[PDB]
Amino acid sequence: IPQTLTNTNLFIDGVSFAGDVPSLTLPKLAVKTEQYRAGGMDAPVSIDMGLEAMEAKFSTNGARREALNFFGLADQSAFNGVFRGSFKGQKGASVPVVATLRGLLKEVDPGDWKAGEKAEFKYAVAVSYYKLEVDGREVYEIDPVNGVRAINGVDQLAGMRNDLGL
């Protein structure tokens, strides 16, 4: 049932960037693993050790102001932004995929201005909070400063929250 992504749009603070954003990138949600090899067994196995540093990145190719004006902002996690993306599907009805991500803008990379090529600024928000929804349905909600890694409702850290006494 071919889905595929058709169109994409990017918000920062309500301000639509319907225009300059030729690339989005959601934070690669990865676990920490640590290949556990130990007594009684050959071949490791790997363990949930917590997630990796979620970093998301978009790249407007316009001097956009509304994006540049969050860089190094004293209040880390002030930059909010929402990465919406419509997946078409061969049978018409498009699936809205939307990923709000309160984080810290971190860095800004304007590449080689060449007087004949889309300048293309770049950005890389060090994501703090991150909720990825599909068809208006929570699939992920990863909150580090709180410990709320919750796959579609069920909170996989509800058990460690207690043992830590949070």
Partner 1 sequence: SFFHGVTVTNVDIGARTIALPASSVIGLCDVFTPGAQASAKPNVPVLLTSKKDAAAAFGIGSSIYLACEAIYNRAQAVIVAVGVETAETPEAQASAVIGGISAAGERTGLQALLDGKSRFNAQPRLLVAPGHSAQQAVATAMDGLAEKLRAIAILDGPNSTDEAAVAYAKNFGSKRLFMVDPGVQVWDSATNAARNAPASAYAAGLFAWTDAEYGFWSSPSNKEIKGVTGTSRPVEFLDGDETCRANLLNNANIATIIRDDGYRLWGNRTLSSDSKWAFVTRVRTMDLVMDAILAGHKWAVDRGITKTYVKDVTEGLRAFMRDLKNQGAVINFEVYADPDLNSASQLAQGKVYWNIRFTDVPPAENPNFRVEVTDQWLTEVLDVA
63: left (phi over 0), alpha (psi -120 to 50) or beta: beta
3 near partner 1 (CB under 8 A):
no
| 40 near a copy of itself (CB under 8 A) | yes
Residue 80 binds partner 1 (CB under 8 A): yes
Residue 163: which of partner 1, a copy of itself, none does it interact with, CB under 5 to 8 A by kind?
none
38 binds partner 1 (CB under 8 A): no
Which residues, other chains included, contact 135 with Cβ-Cβ below 8 Å and sequence gap of 6+? 95, 96
112 CB-contact burial (10 Å; exposed 0-12 / middle 13-18 / buried 19+):
exposed
Q: Which of 12, 82, 101, 126 is close enough to bind a copy of itself by CB under 8 A?
A: 126
Beta strand pairing call for 5-11 and 82-87: antiparallel
Tell me the two tokens of residue 49: 């050790």
When CB distances are held under 5 to 8 angstroms depending on the partner's kind, the choice from a copy of itself, partner 1, none that residue 43 binds is a copy of itself
Q: Applying CB under 8 A, which residues contact partner 1?
A: 1, 11, 13-14, 16, 80, 82, 91, 100, 102, 129, 143, 145-146
